[PDB]
Design a protein around this ligand. Structure first.
Ligand SMILES: O=S(=O)(O)CCS
Ligand SMILES: [Zn+2]
Length: 340
């Protein structure tokens, strides 16, 4: 059976810690790059709103790069926009970002709407998953990406209020977190229904760079656990920054895989504190290695990750849009060279 893996079965097995023939190489974070936008005719920002173009751009960084999955969409704003956040849609090389927060003072009116799945670009993402499945077939995995519940709550109330309430109005923090989690689960299961094989949430606001490890444990962990156990899929939890102080807690959250940056140090250092509770995904620096290169540095840092027991070889965060195609190929070549 070790000789019969598909790209899909290898990723799922790897994330679950089952035996595999080799470590898979892919990205669970955003994969839109300028060089590919130009090659296949699917540039931002149009690729965020047109499902066919969203599909094409995502496909390109599988077919033309060798990454062993397809990942969509390209931003952390689809769900929060659907929940009332105002968004700036960015540019050809700048991601959409949140500019307006609907609930900076109180949660009056914040309930999750019955028509959530019809709002904003949620229908675009769901359709793009179906289109991508058509284009790659059943044996290549589709990773559905989204902002996580902590980041959703914070986007809804503004990060200033979120941080303030964490100390001074913890009941409101919790209410915001519960609404955010409920909406996140509904969206994540919708993506599973549409064809996603893995749901990979990115929750930067849960990072120790922004929230204390103690507040992670006290308030955030239980919602991340509720998310993982309510979503009917293998899941991955991505949190950037130096997450070492919460890495064990991340490993308790019910996600099969933990996606981390280079800021944890070597993959081995991470493996040594999570044991068999969760698998590790990463961790080659997106801005400081994949973006500038050189190819040889990408490969060396990738090989260190593999030697340290990384379960899925991946960029540490979103691929920087100006990343050359050749640098993405380098990540794949490193895995291939590793197995001789
Ligand atoms: O993958 S993304 O670049 O969209 C976000 C990472 S925190
Ligand atoms: Zn990140």
């Amino acid at each position: 059976d070790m000789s019969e893996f598909t790209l899909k079965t290898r990723l799922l097995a790897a994330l679950k810690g089952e035996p595999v023939d080799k470590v898979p190489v892919c990205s669970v974070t955003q994969t839109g790059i300028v060089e590919l936008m130009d090659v296949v005719g699917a540039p931002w920002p149009e690729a965020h709103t047109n499902p066919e173009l969203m599909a094409k751009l995502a496909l390109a960084n599988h077919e033309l790069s060798g990454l062993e999955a397809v990942r969509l969409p390209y931003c952390l704003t689809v769900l929060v926009e659907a929940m009332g956040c105002e968004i700036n849609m960015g540019t050809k090389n700048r991601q959409p970002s949140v500019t307006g927060h609907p609930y900076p003072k109180d949660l009056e009116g914040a309930a999750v709407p019955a028509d959530l799945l019809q709002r904003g670009r949620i229908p675009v993402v769901l359709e793009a998953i179906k289109i991508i499945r058509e284009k790659v077939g059943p044996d290549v995995p589709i990773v559905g990406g989204m902002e996580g519940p902590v980041t959703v709550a914070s986007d809804l109330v503004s990060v200033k209020s979120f941080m303030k309430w964490s100390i001074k109005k913890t009941d409101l923090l919790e209410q915001a977190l519960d609404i955010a989690t409920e909406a996140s689960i509904i969206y994540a299961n919708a993506m599973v229904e549409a064809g996603a094989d893995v749901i990979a949430i990115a929750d930067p606001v849960a990072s120790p760079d922004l929230m204390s490890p103690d507040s992670f444990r006290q308030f955030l962990k239980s919602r991340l656990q509720k998310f993982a156990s309510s979503v009917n899929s293998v899941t991955v939890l991505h949190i950037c920054g130096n997450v070492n102080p919460i890495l064990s807690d991340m490993a308790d959250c019910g996600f099969e895989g933990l996606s981390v940056e280079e800021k944890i140090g070597s993959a081995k250092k991470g493996k040594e504190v999570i044991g068999t509770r969760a698998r590790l995904v990463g961790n080659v620096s997106s801005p400081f290695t994949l973006l500038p290169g050189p190819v040889d540095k990408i490969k060396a840092e990738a090989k260190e990750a593999l030697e340290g027991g990384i379960d899925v070889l991946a960029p540490g965060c979103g691929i920087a849009p100006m990343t050359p195609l050749e640098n993405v190929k380098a990540l794949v070549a490193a895995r291939d060279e590793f197995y001789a």
